[PDB]
Amino acid sequence: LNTIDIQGDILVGMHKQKQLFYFFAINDPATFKTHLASDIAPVVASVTQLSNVATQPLVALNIAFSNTGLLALGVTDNLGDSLFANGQAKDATSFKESTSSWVPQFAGTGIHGVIILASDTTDLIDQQVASIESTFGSSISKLYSLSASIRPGNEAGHEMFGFLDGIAQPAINGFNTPLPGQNIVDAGVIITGATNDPITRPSWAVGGSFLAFRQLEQLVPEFNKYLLDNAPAGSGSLQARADLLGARMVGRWKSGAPIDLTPTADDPALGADAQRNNNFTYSHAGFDLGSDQSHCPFSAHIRKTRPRADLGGSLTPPNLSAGANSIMRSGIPYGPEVTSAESASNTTTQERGLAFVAYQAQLSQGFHFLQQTWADNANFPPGKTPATVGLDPIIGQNNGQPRVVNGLLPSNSSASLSIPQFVVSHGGEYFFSPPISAIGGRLSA
Numbered sequence: 001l002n003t004i005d006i007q008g009d010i011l012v013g014m015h016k017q018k019q020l021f022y023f024f025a026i027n028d029p030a031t032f033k034t035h036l037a038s039d040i041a042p043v044v045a046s047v048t049q050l051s052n053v054a055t056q057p058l059v060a061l062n063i064a065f066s067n068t069g070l071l072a073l074g075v076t077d078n079l080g081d082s083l084f085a086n087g088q089a090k091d092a093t094s095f096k097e098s099t100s101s102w103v104p105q106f107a108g109t110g111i112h113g114v115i116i117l118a119s120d121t122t123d124l125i126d127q128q129v130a131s132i133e134s135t136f137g138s139s140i141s142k143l144y145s146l147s148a149s150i151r152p153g154n155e156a157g158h159e160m161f162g163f164l165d166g167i168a169q170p171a172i173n174g175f176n177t178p179l180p181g182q183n184i185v186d187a188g189v190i191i192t193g194a195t196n197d198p199i200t201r202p203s204w205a206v207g208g209s210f211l212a213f214r215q216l217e218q219l220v221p222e223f224n225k226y227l228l229d230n231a232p233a234g235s236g237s238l239q240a241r242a243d244l245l246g247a248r249m250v251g252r253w254k255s256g257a258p259i260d261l262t263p264t265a266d267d268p269a270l271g272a273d274a275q276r277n278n279n280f281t282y283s284h285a286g287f288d289l290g291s292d293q294s295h296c297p298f299s300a301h302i303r304k305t306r307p308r309a310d311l312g313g314s315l316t317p318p319n320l321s322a323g324a325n326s327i328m329r330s331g332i333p334y335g336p337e338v339t340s341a342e343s344a345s346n347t348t349t350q351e352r353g354l355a356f357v358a359y360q361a362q363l364s365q366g367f368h369f370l371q372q373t374w375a376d377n378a379n380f381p382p383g384k385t386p387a388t389v390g391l392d393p394i395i396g397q398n399n400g401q402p403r404v405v406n407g408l409l410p411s412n413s414s415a416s417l418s419i420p421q422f423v424v425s426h427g428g429e430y431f432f433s434p435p436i437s438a439i440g441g442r443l444s445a
């Protein structure tokens with residue numbers, strides 16, 4: 001790997017308090033290219049730079065292009081990815097959703113790219129945006145944007161449902177020092193043209209990655225109310241038992257504690273411990289892997305998206321199964337905190353959610369595969385008893401309607417729940433984040 005030439009959000013994440021997703025079209029390739037080379041390319045933050053606190057810019061900038069943006073730039077080379085080429089709108093029906101609920105700018109292929117601006121204040125971001133718009137002039141056009149932020153206080157690093165996020169990533173072999181239980185993968189799973197990437201890419205694409213962007217609204221008061229209404233009977237407060245159900249749905253407690261290691265009560269100390277909070281496989285000493293949902297439901301979100309021992313491999317950490325289906329996640333929450341009024345009425349009045357960002361070298365193996373073949377598949381994971389696992393309670397989709405999810409109730413692993421959508425996709429796009437040398441190189445030529 002040459003982490004000098006790889007955009008930082010791909011392998012490191014921007015790790016700033018604020019981010020802006022600036023979605024643009026290219027009006028005029030010729031003028032746009034000039035300013036791409038002079039104004040954008042030299043300030044794109046790399047993995048190497050973001051990997052050291054002393055070399056992190058006040059504004060971390062990354063930029064990615066859609067198939068039609070690349071077309072607008074006169075670049076027609078085959079990036080080796082049909083899903084990217086066709087755009088996410090065309091792919092929506094693969095996830096049993098429709099472009100009906102999408103931001104209208106996303107329901108098409110008019111968006112040519114996205115600029116990711118990140119800084120610890122919104123002030124610095126808007127300065128950089130004002131400069132970009134000034135210098136590019138009418139060669140660029142803003143079609144849509146989404147402002148996002150780290151949540152405040154003790155919810156920093158947690159997503160809108162309140163769960164600590166950004167714990168689990170694939171370790172890239174030869175680059176990351178793997179953590180206990182962490183999967184270890186070839187660089188080519190995430191970085192196009194890198195080690196063991198079987199797909200031929202254009203020359204200017206080596207060091208890049210596909211960026212799956214999803215604007216995912218979360219119905220937080222509704223979720224909270226559902227958990228309280230369905231809290232399993234037992235010891236502790238109603239909220240504690242409600243939290244237990246929530247944790248069974250995610251596969252982690254709000255603290256980050258993986259339920260597979262903490263199956264009856266939260267242990268917040270575990271969530272804060274990078275050396276132990278991923279050290280599991282779903283295998284347990286005296287339990288049948290195929291039928292035991294006492295530690296973690298077969299349908300739990302993280303078990304659906306990283307099956308670990310459910311797809312074979314070592315029963316002791318680290319489990320190394322399904323390395324090719326790993327994704328890097330750089331998502332960040334958007335929208336305001338939940339208000340008292342919303343909580344009292346258990347009803348959302350304004351949009352908040354996750355600005356979901358997934359990187360992978362193959363869309364068909366990454367985001368698209370986890371959503372369609374695993375999360376939305378009522379019979380995944382395979383070989384379980386009962387065999388009908390049901391859907392991912394967090395992201396599983398059923399054309400807008402309630403999702404049948406099994407195994408969630410600790411007192412009865414055959415008990416089914418009919419769970420309304422908590423996450424409402426408003427769509428997004430598939431982009432390609434090029435290596436930095438390509439931005440001021442071929443893409444500006």
Ligand code: HEM
Binds near residue numbers: 214329354375
């Ligand atoms: C609003 C929607 C979503 C929410 C609230 C959500 C929430 C979470 C949470 C709380 C975790 C645990 C933190 C961690 O392990 O790092 C997690 C992990 C993860 N999620 Fe999601 N997520 C969402 C969307 C998605 C989507 C759309 C995908 C893929 C299609 C996805 C794939 C993953 C993966 C791969 C992990 C790590 C699993 C592992 O390595 O064990 N998430 N998510």
